[PDB]
Amino acid sequence: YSGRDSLIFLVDASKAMFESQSEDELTPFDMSIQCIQSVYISKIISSDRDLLAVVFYGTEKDKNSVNFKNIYVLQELDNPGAKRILELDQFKGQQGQKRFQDMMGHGSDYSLSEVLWVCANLFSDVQFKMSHKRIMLFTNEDNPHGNDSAKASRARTKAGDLRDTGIFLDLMHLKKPGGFDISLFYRDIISILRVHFEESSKLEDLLRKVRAKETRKRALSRLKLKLNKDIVISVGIYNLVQKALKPPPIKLYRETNEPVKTKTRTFNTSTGGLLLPSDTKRSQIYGSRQIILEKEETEELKRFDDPGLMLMGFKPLVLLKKHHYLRPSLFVYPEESLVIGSSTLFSALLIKCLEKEVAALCRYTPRRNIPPYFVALVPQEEELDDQKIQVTPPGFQLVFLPFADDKRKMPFTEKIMATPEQVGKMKAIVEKLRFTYRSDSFENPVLQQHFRNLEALALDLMEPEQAVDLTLPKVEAMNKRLGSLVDEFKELVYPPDYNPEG
Amino acid sequence: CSLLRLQETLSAADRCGAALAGHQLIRGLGQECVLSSSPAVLALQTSLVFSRDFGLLVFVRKSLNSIEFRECREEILKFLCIFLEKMGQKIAPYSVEIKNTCTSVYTKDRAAK
Amino acid sequence: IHWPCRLTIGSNLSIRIAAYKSILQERVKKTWTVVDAKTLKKEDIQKETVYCLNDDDETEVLKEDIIQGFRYGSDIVPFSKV
DNA sequence: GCTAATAAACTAAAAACTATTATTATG
DNA sequence: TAATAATAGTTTTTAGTTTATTGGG
């Protein structure tokens, strides 16, 4: 476990963000409003266990524990909730902004030293393990402190102090018709050449709703692989791919909505009196005879070896059947917590097996009273992309070897060939349908629709967002690109009267 | 008195839903603990009825799984334990009441937490 | 056993298929039945569950009165299966 | 023309993961 | 007289159920 992420949003309460040169486009205030809605929805989906806050500056009024004028905290650092979303949406729109200007001031002066003070205080209020302190400002003018030289000086001094205290300030470009004018007052003041008449730096991804749990880094188990019996090496086991499942529901009352707990009891029938686990006897009836046993023998019959890995040998990667797959593989990394120096030997063995193209087959015991399976550890060399970031971790791929009784028998199938011209037809059809696949191209539409419905009902929308399913083939485009080829190959193989459907 | 005014403030101090309320409550409870831990002959008897009201006070008021109540309740329990450790049987009139509270304390949301 | 279905390509090509689970994880087909410690009977030892309120002296919520909800960020919304 | 499993979703349940906190040690 | 050391508190699978649902005859 490590620290968490803290996010601060600070919008200027002025006239610039409530107006635009083209009213057909979104006002900076309102577009920032949809921006924060989108980021809060994404945070709810992904990392709702962190802290988010809303605060404005330049407003005519003020409200903050620091009691700085024109400084008004709208939301304290807190986990996002639908109440926050609606509290923000009521100010959304070209009428919500008018409301905001009605019962909330805007346009007065401010001090960046003051806002830095209040945000530092708010961050200091958090007593939890933090790792990221990101502050996002929302204004399109570098001048307002350039107007007062002393104000700019103290603002940049406090900004430097804050950035030295681990606070990370990032700049949100806002649509200034005269230009955002970076490098004039900002890059020397922000923690990090077009003057940015526009606003879109990465606001496209900020507005982009993301549906992902994104579980933080964790160790499934730090098993300790024994070579023969005593030369034993600590290793870490992870699952870089792991099935994402719907969170379980919450039993609650249909008249108060509060979650009602459930208690479960094993008891008698003739008397109905509550009974004990000692009163429970495991039974299994085979044929006509019932065998009586207890649980402890049941797990002891599953207990053969200690939790760990027992090497079976070495085998070239060619000696494994491609269709021989049982369960999704795991990733194995060297670990130096229990056994120190194992990283050197891990590097040596990785180099040697990569040179010898032989994977390591081992007897695997996950935990106590667990079956030891057969696992093949393929070398997995580190790969870096263009920006030299790790796209393939260095280590080992731990795949599972199904047993003889883990494979099922099929009715025998004969071999029937095809003419090479039909093969050419297939190749042409494939080329007309070819593309490049990437692992980040297809999602689970069922889960996405479930989400969209969940947020829609949480937001009490009259209608939910429809999930875009990429697993639906575009039949019209495929038919357009194929045309003759389909029925040409049909006539090549299928008799004209004998359609594939009887 | 100091015990009485602190009891009244804590009976108020939980009016708002915030962890700060629990912080101030447990601070006042710690001061009450260090105060009434050493009475002479008399302040203990006042603390008896004060504990009555404040005991049943939180029993019916806090009544929430919020941790801000949880630390205060556990400190209250620790103080009551160290009190009854050397307090005499004069607390017996409250005890069965406390009994009628204590299990009701535990079997309630305290069971959930 | 086969899987009688039809592969499809676009809206103008389809072929009937018969899929087979060549590799399949195995499980025990006989569960561990629970019986009495004295009569060794499951009949004498049957089961129930209780949905009682977390407060109010564990007042019993009626079996169907419970409705599932779901965690939503910092909030929980009631949400039935229907 | 007479009924027939089945994986999904549902539980319990069991372990690993940080995260602390009496406890002598000494006086 | 005051320091250390197992130690319980949130996630995450995963074995055993439980649902009706297609597939037939």
Swiss-Prot record, chain A:
The modification N6-acetyllysine is found at residues 281, 295, 302, 425. The chain holds residues 32 to 538 of 609 of the full protein. It comes from the Eukaryota. GO terms for cellular component: chromosome, telomeric region; cytosol; DNA-dependent protein kinase complex; DNA-dependent protein kinase-DNA ligase 4 complex; extracellular region; ficolin-1-rich granule lumen; Ku70:Ku80 complex; membrane. Residues 241-305 are annotated as: DNA-binding. This is X-ray repair cross-complementing protein 6. Induction: In osteoblasts, by FGF2. Keywords: Acetylation, Activator, ADP-ribosylation, ATP-binding, Chromosome, Cytoplasm, DNA damage, DNA recombination, DNA repair, DNA-binding, Helicase, Host-virus interaction, Hydrolase, Immunity, Innate immunity, Isopeptide bond, Lyase, Methylation, Multifunctional enzyme, Nucleotide-binding, Nucleus, Phosphoprotein, Systemic lupus erythematosus, Transcription, Transcription regulation, Ubl conjugation. The keyword Transmembrane helix does not apply. GO terms for molecular function: 5'-deoxyribose-5-phosphate lyase activity; ATP binding; ATP hydrolysis activity; ATP-dependent activity, acting on DNA; cyclin binding; damaged DNA binding; DNA binding; DNA helicase activity. One of its GO terms (biological process) is positive regulation of transcription by RNA polymerase II.
From Swiss-Prot, chain B:
The chain holds residues 10 to 122 of 4128 of the full protein. The gene is PRKDC. Serine/threonine-protein kinase that acts as a molecular sensor for DNA damage. Involved in DNA non-homologous end joining (NHEJ) required for double-strand break (DSB) repair and V(D)J recombination. Must be bound to DNA to express its catalytic properties. Promotes processing of hairpin DNA structures in V(D)J recombination by activation of the hairpin endonuclease artemis (DCLRE1C). Recruited by XRCC5 and XRCC6 to DNA ends and is required to (1) protect and align broken ends of DNA, thereby preventing their degradation, (2) and sequester the DSB for repair by NHEJ. Belongs to the PI3/PI4-kinase family. The modification N6-acetyllysine is found at residue 108. It comes from the Eukaryota. Autophosphorylated at two clusters, the T2609 cluster and the S2056 cluster. Autophosphorylation induces a conformational change that leads to remodeling of the DNA-PK complex, requisite for efficient end processing and DNA repair. It is linked to Immunodeficiency 26 with or without neurologic abnormalities: A form of severe combined immunodeficiency characterized by reduced or absent T and B cells, recurrent candidiasis, and lower respiratory tract infections. Some patients show dysmorphic features, severe growth failure, microcephaly, seizures, and impaired neurological functions. This is DNA-dependent protein kinase catalytic subunit. It is found in: Nucleus; Nucleus, Nucleolus; Cytoplasm, Cytosol.
Swiss-Prot record, chain C:
Transmembrane segments: none annotated. It comes from the Eukaryota. The modification N6-acetyllysine is found at residue 21. Induction: In osteoblasts, by FGF2. The modification Phosphoserine is found at residues 11, 14, 74. It is found in: Nucleus; Nucleus, Nucleolus; Chromosome. ADP-ribosylated by PARP3. The EEXXXDDL motif is required for the interaction with catalytic subunit PRKDC and its recruitment to sites of DNA damage. The VWFA domain interacts with the KBM (Ku-binding motif) found in a number of DNA repair proteins. Individuals with systemic lupus erythematosus (SLE) and related disorders produce extremely large amounts of autoantibodies to XRCC6 and XRCC5. Single-stranded DNA-dependent ATP-dependent helicase that plays a key role in DNA non-homologous end joining (NHEJ) by recruiting DNA-PK to DNA. Required for double-strand break repair and V(D)J recombination. Also has a role in chromosome translocation. The DNA helicase II complex binds preferentially to fork-like ends of double-stranded DNA in a cell cycle-dependent manner. It works in the 3'-5' direction. During NHEJ, the XRCC5-XRRC6 dimer performs the recognition step: it recognizes and binds to the broken ends of the DNA and protects them from further resection. Heterodimer composed of XRCC5/Ku80 and XRCC6/Ku70; heterodimerization stabilizes XRCC5 protein. Component of the core long-range non-homologous end joining (NHEJ) complex (also named DNA-PK complex) composed of PRKDC, LIG4, XRCC4, XRCC6/Ku70, XRCC5/Ku86 and NHEJ1/XLF. Additional component of the NHEJ complex includes PAXX. Following autophosphorylation, PRKDC dissociates from DNA, leading to formation of the short-range NHEJ complex, composed of LIG4, XRCC4, XRCC6/Ku70, XRCC5/Ku86 and NHEJ1/XLF. Belongs to the ku80 family. This is X-ray repair cross-complementing protein 5. It comes from Homo sapiens (Human). The chain holds residues 245 to 326 of 732 of the full protein.
